[PDB]
Structures are given as C-alpha cells and as structure tokens.
C-alpha cells in the first residue's frame, strides 16, 4: 500500500510494480479480445446457424484461449 510507503526507494519499487502489472494486464486485454471474438462466432453457430458467421467454432476453441489466460494468472 502507498499509505505505508515513504521514501525514494519505496516509491521506485512501487512504480516498478505498477508498470509490470500494467504490461501483464495489457497482455490480458489482447487475449480477452480474442476470447470475445471466438465467443461471438460461437453464439453465431446457434443464433445464426445458416449464416456465413457460423464458422464451426466450438467451446473447445474458446477453452484453448481460457488456458492461455490461466498461464498469465499463474
């Protein structure tokens, strides 16, 4: 916490933590956009079966993205 942080050393470490957490959260955002796209085509498989958007996406294709998300959180 920043309340118990005081000094040049504690701040430089705290700023480093916020930068490292941002880069890992920006990587999380890019992965989540791929999960959204894969989920959109997954729902198109049933709400629009005869449409051009029904590209054969299954839940396993979304769970493959779920596995990469759990790698970053580990």
């Amino acid at each position: 916490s920043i309340s118990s942080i005081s000094g040049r050393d504690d701040l430089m470490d705290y700023h480093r933590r916020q930068r490292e957490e941002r880069l890992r959260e920006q990587e999380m955002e890019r992965l989540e956009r791929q999960r959204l796209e894969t989920i959109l085509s997954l729902c198109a498989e049933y709400t629009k079966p005869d449409s051009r958007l029904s590209t054969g996406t299954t839940v396993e294709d979304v769970q493959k993205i779920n596995k990469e998300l759990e790698k970053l959180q580990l």
Partner: protein, 54 residues
C-alpha cells in the same frame, strides 16, 4: 545553512513529486486496460445468455 537545508528538501520533494506522477500514469493505464477487459467479458456474458434462450 538552514536555507541550503531547506533547499535540499525542495529537491527531495521534487523527485518524489516526479515519481508520484509517473506512478499515476501507470495506474491510469491499468484502470483503462481493465475497463476494456471488463467490457469484453460483459459482452461475452450477455451474448452467451442471449444464445441460451435459443
């Protein structure tokens, strides 16, 4: 004497103000990139619920 001691703390607080502002920019991007992930997961949930009704 006491002027230089006071002038020394001015440079100390200035570098601390520098670090506090650079840390604010990193947290601005953290909140912003988390706002985008939340909206992506909210649209995912809603599209899965609209699909279950079919």
């Amino acid at each position: 004497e006491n002027f230089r001691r006071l002038q020394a703390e001015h440079d100390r607080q200035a570098k601390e103000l520098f670090l506090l502002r650079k840390t604010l920019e990193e947290m601005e991007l953290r909140i912003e990139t988390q706002k985008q992930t939340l909206n992506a997961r909210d649209e995912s949930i809603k599209k899965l619920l609209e699909m279950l009704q079919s």
